[PDB]
């Protein structure tokens, strides 16, 4: 439901952002005020990633 998959690689630009790899699964906690950033959890930790870089799976 909040289970997602990464569409593209994203390299953390610091400031509480999280690196993710295409194909990786994430759990989504929420979004920032404009929906552009998504706060997510993966095996590598927790942080903000682009909302457009991920999508629900299953």
């Amino acid at each position: 439901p909040n289970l997602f998959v990464a569409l593209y690689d994203f390299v953390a630009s610091g400031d509480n952002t999280l690196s993710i790899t295409k194909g990786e699964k994430l759990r989504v906690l929420g979004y920032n005020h404009n929906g552009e950033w998504c706060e997510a959890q993966t095996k590598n930790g927790q942080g903000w990633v682009p909302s457009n870089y991920i999508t629900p799976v299953n």
Partner: peptide
């Protein structure tokens, strides 16, 4: 969340 915009997807 970051104050700047995220990169656009490709």
């Amino acid at each position: 969340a970051p104050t700047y915009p995220p990169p656009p997807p490709p």
